[PDB]
Design an enzyme around this catalytic site. Structure first.
Site, PDB file in Angstrom:
ATOM      1  N   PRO A  34      44.507  40.302  45.442  1.00  0.00           N
ATOM      2  CA  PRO A  34      44.027  41.605  45.978  1.00  0.00           C
ATOM      3  C   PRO A  34      43.484  41.513  47.390  1.00  0.00           C
ATOM      4  CG  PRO A  34      43.265  41.226  43.732  1.00  0.00           C
ATOM      5  CD  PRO A  34      43.809  39.928  44.186  1.00  0.00           C
ATOM      6  N   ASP A  35      43.656  42.574  48.150  1.00  0.00           N
ATOM      7  CA  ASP A  35      43.019  42.638  49.449  1.00  0.00           C
ATOM      8  C   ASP A  35      41.659  43.352  49.350  1.00  0.00           C
ATOM      9  OD1 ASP A  35      42.867  42.161  52.250  1.00  0.00           O
ATOM     10  OD2 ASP A  35      43.476  44.209  52.627  1.00  0.00           O
ATOM     11  N   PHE A  36      40.608  42.576  49.583  1.00  0.00           N
ATOM     12  CA  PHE A  36      39.255  43.130  49.515  1.00  0.00           C
ATOM     13  C   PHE A  36      39.043  44.303  50.479  1.00  0.00           C
ATOM     14  CE2 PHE A  36      38.754  40.596  53.162  1.00  0.00           C
ATOM     15  CZ  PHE A  36      37.637  41.088  53.863  1.00  0.00           C
ATOM     16  N   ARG A  37      39.830  44.342  51.548  1.00  0.00           N
ATOM     17  CA  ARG A  37      39.696  45.382  52.573  1.00  0.00           C
ATOM     18  C   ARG A  37      40.559  46.576  52.252  1.00  0.00           C
ATOM     19  NH1 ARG A  37      39.544  41.896  58.199  1.00  0.00           N
ATOM     20  NH2 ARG A  37      40.800  40.421  56.885  1.00  0.00           N
ATOM     21  N   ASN A 108      44.101  31.420  54.165  1.00  0.00           N
ATOM     22  CA  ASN A 108      43.693  31.987  52.878  1.00  0.00           C
ATOM     23  C   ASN A 108      42.487  31.236  52.318  1.00  0.00           C
ATOM     24  OD1 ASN A 108      46.044  33.456  53.364  1.00  0.00           O
ATOM     25  ND2 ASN A 108      47.284  32.204  51.963  1.00  0.00           N
ATOM     26  N   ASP A 110      42.029  31.581  48.854  1.00  0.00           N
ATOM     27  CA  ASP A 110      42.336  31.755  47.444  1.00  0.00           C
ATOM     28  C   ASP A 110      42.649  30.447  46.743  1.00  0.00           C
ATOM     29  OD1 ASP A 110      45.131  31.031  47.842  1.00  0.00           O
ATOM     30  OD2 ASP A 110      45.417  33.129  48.633  1.00  0.00           O
ATOM     31  N   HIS A 127      39.516  28.941  57.035  1.00  0.00           N
ATOM     32  CA  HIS A 127      38.525  29.946  56.634  1.00  0.00           C
ATOM     33  C   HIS A 127      37.557  29.414  55.572  1.00  0.00           C
ATOM     34  CE1 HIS A 127      40.407  33.327  58.844  1.00  0.00           C
ATOM     35  NE2 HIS A 127      39.312  33.993  58.519  1.00  0.00           N
TER      36      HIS A 127
END
Ligand SMILES: [Zn+2]
Length: 273
Positions: A34-37, A108, A110, A127
């Site tokens: 999922p994209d948190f944004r 990423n 993830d 990141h």
């Protein structure tokens, strides 16, 4: 001009033994990350119940120390286990297993690279990672495995020595990139191939790395479209397979003649999972 097929041939002819890969969000969408944004999701909906001026605030220290619970919501969601690598990931796993992968720079968080079976030492997570954590107060290091239970239980992990907050080693705004990022100084000069999957190459200094490879070194972009430095300064040995990342990758696996082997690796690997 080279084609995808010409690059495939370099690999087949064994002329590419030190590949350097840069990958972004485009490789993890397939796995359903999922994209948190992005609105419309389960995770976006979750963060919406907190007092946050925008979704990006969960990556700001001042917010974290005001209330850490927003971030740990995203953490719970992205923590290893929830998601399974895809063919894109296992493809990079294959490169490793053929002794062809010099390094894999990812943006990423993830973790799907570690899960697909690629060793920390081949990775540089620009990141940060959930696979480890630091105590905010006393600076102590801990395996992600250790705050696991608290994060799945909605509890704020606390240091055992000083009982401060234990934070996953993700990078927040203003934070300096992980130490491992400086491996680019030795990795890019040494690359015989540069592979770029599923990234729009905006974030610096990540994007600018594509400019560190030698001019004699082909650069291959598999991605939704032509982007950043690859677009603005083209090079003669650049190849773009523009389109669906999964599709493009299956094509390369084809041109490499790795179909059989990929089909297999993907079945041992997600079997276990
Ligand atoms: Zn501590």
């Amino acid at each position: 001009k080279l084609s995808l097929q010409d690059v495939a041939e370099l690999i087949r002819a064994r002329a590419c033994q030190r590949v350097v890969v840069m990958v972004g969000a485009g490789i993890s969408t397939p796995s359903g990350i999922p994209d948190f944004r992005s609105p419309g999701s389960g995770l976006y909906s979750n963060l919406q119940q907190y007092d946050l001026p925008y979704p990006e605030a969960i990556f700001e220290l001042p917010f974290f120390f005001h209330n850490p619970k927003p971030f740990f919501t995203l953490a719970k969601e992205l923590y290893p286990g929830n998601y399974k690598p895809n063919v894109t990931h296992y493809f990079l796993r294959l490169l490793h297993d053929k002794g062809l992968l010099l390094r894999l720079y990812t943006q990423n968080i993830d973790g799907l690279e570690r899960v697909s079976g690629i060793p920390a030492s081949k990775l540089v997570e620009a990141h940060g990672t959930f696979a480890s954590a630091t105590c905010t107060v006393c600076q102590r290091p801990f395996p992600g495995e250790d705050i696991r239970a608290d994060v799945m239980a909605d509890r704020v992990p606390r240091c055992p020595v000083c009982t401060g907050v234990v934070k996953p080693d993700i990078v927040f705004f203003g934070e300096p990139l992980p130490q491992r990022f400086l491996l680019h100084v030795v990795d890019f000069p040494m690359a015989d191939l540069l592979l770029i999957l599923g990234t729009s190459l905006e974030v610096e200094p990540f994007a600018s790395l594509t400019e560190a490879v030698r001019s004699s070194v082909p650069r291959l972009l598999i991605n939704r479209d032509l982007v950043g430095p690859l677009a603005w300064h083209p090079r003669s040995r650049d190849v773009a397979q523009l389109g669906d990342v999964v599709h493009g990758v299956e094509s390369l696996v084809e041109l490499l003649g790795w179909t059989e082997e990929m089909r297999d690796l993907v079945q041992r690997e997600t079997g276990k999972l």
